[PDB]
Design an enzyme around this catalytic site. Structure first.
Site, short mmCIF file in Angstrom:
data_model
loop_
_atom_site.label_atom_id
_atom_site.label_comp_id
_atom_site.label_asym_id
_atom_site.label_seq_id
_atom_site.Cartn_x
_atom_site.Cartn_y
_atom_site.Cartn_z
N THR B 1 -57.76 17.78 -4.54
CA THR B 1 -56.82 18.54 -3.82
C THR B 1 -55.69 17.57 -3.23
O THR B 1 -56.12 16.43 -2.75
CB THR B 1 -57.04 19.34 -2.63
N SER B 61 -58.43 27.68 0.20
CA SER B 61 -58.05 27.41 1.64
C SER B 61 -56.52 26.76 1.66
O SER B 61 -56.24 26.71 2.94
CB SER B 61 -59.16 26.66 2.46
#
Ligand SMILES: [Ca+2]
Lengths: 359, 178
Positions: B1, B61
């Site tokens: 990410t 998230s």
């Protein structure tokens, strides 16, 4: 809320300073691509799209065309929006698809096989953003990434180290991935040139034909074929059906500041706002950075939030998320009132909150 | 990410977090496209709401975040790091608002994290032994673990002065402007 500090020469850590525009990213080259877009007259969205395409070339670890993500945009006039370009499960996806013979999750199946992939949203989300909020055509914002792919760039420490450590586990196991990221039977290392000719072609054709190249064109054919021949689920129907979704950001007030974050399918934005709501009941500035007291209050507030997180979240196109109740300040107070600065409550005694009074 | 932030001269702002999931994702390039494919399906619960199903987005998230002060964009931030994203972003906001730390100070400050389960207060290196002993006395179960996050953040003065910080936890990163 005390006075803010923007920075003084007397500080240990100094911000980067600029008068006009700025870009912050994990990769120097991609950051510089973004700054140059801003220099040439592009707006924040224009540069954001250019940086995203740049990282898809220079930061193959996570920058991507074959994955997805989230964007928040706030315009000069104060309109704040969210773009959800998270991957979608293929139409052929099933609840038990990751279970082995014995009914147990198979971690490798959901990580390193062709079934591990969701329908990629990045190119869709970037174009939704660019078309609605940008000022430049896709061809111009993709060009920097195109050149980096076609001409190559020098491998740095970050990319070299990731290639050796994480890359080794997945890349050389496949001919076509190994052909790009390995050289003479070992990973590309610092000082080598990474050229990405196939990726340059993809980028060239996206620049020329638009996002339909990815979702309906040659790239779509390449993805579908890779999936069909190797036991994956992503079809041409999946790719043509993919749509990025603009959503309303979650927001909260914290001490007179407005905090905007990503709503569902983010499991994070709601809870940043919730934790801030809880913390607002305490004089955080009084305890101060790195004090036992501040860390205690925050750790305890986080527990309640993470317990709610485990229960109430989902894809909002599939389930009703009680975001209003979770971001309710009376609910946050009810949590704050339970926090004991001198005694941590064991997680075994913390459950998802009763939301009915706040719905 | 990975996360990146942009602010332009007109005061428009963008925060992007996007990902293959794991580093290089599946490691599978899609035929002759040069494109690595995500392993995002791992983010579903494999065995109710976040269970695998067709046409569904797995929960993430990821939290690109923009804070507004006195009516204007003031902080743009975000980070990788799975569930730790929440606490990393939270600490950026708390550091900037409550502790009056400049964006670089807020960024280089050590990070802690409690995600309810496991029941541990996770810390990076950098908190005082005196403070950690006090937390243990309060009931906290302190766990020293690896660095969390890679924040890439921009703070904006009311006059349009820009202030940026790249995470020390990520090498070869950059915040730059003009
Ligand atoms: Ca750094």
């Amino acid at each position: 809320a005390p006075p803010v500090s923007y920075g003084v020469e007397e500080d240990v850590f100094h911000p980067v300073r600029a008068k006009q525009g700025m870009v912050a990213s994990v990769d120097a080259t991609a950051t510089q691509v973004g700054v140059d877009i801003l220099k040439e007259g592009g707006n924040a969205v224009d540069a954001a799209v250019a940086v995203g395409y740049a990282l898809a070339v220079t930061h193959p670890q996570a920058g991507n065309l074959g994955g997805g993500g989230f964007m928040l945009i706030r315009s000069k006039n104060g309109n704040t929006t969210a773009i959800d370009f998270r991957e979608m499960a293929p139409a052929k996806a099933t609840r038990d698809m990751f279970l082995d013979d014995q009914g147990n999750p198979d971690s490798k199946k959901s990580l390193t096989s062709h079934l591990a992939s969701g329908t990629p949203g990045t190119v869709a989300g970037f174009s939704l953003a660019l078309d609605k909020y940008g000022t430049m055509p896709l061809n111009k914002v993709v060009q920097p990434a195109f050149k980096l792919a076609r001409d190559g760039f020098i491998v740095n420490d970050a990319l070299a180290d990731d290639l050796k450590t994480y890359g080794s586990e997945v890349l050389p196991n496949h001919e076509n991935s190994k052909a790009i990221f390995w050289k003479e039977g070992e990973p590309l290392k610092k000082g080598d040139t990474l050229v990405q000719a196939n990726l340059a072609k993809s980028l060239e054709m996206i620049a020329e034909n638009g996002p339909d190249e990815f979702y309906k064109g040659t790239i779509a054919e390449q993805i579908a074929q890779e999936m069909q021949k190797n036991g994956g689920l992503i079809t041409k129907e999946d790719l043509a059906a993919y749509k990025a979704v603009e959503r309303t950001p979650i927001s909260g007030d914290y001490r007179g500041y407005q905090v905007y974050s990503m709503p569902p399918p983010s499991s994070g934005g709601i809870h940043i706002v919730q934790i801030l709501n809880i913390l607002e009941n305490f004089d955080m500035k009084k305890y101060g950075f790195g004090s036992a007291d501040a860390m205690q209050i925050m750790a305890e507030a986080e527990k309640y939030a993470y317990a709610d997180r485990s229960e109430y979240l989902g894809d909002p196109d599939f389930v009703k998320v009680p975001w209003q109740a979770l971001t309710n300040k009376a609910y946050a107070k009810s949590i704050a009132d339970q926090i004991d600065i001198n005694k941590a409550k064991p997680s075994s005694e913390i459950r998802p909150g009763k939301l009915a009074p706040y719905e | 990410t990975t996360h990146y932030s942009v602010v332009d001269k007109d005061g428009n702002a963008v925060a992007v977090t996007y990902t293959l999931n794991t580093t290089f994702g599946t490691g599978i390039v899609a035929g002759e496209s040069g494109i690595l494919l995500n392993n995002q399906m791992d983010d579903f619960s494999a065995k109710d709401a976040n269970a695998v199903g067709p046409n569904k987005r797995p929960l993430s998230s990821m939290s690109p975040t923009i804070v507004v002060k006195d009516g204007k964009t003031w902080l743009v931030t975000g980070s990788p790091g799975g569930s730790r994203i929440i606490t990393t972003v939270l600490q950026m906001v708390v550091n900037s608002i409550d502790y009056g730390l400049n964006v670089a100070e807020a960024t280089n400050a050590p990070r802690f994290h409690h995600q309810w389960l496991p029941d541990e207060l996770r810390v990076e290196k950098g908190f005082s032994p005196d403070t950690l002993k006090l937390l243990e006395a309060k009931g906290q179960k302190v766990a020293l673990k690896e660095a969390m996050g890679s924040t890439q953040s921009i703070m904006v003065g009311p006059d349009g002065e820009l202030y940026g910080a790249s995470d020390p936890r990520s090498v070869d990163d950059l915040t730059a402007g003009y």
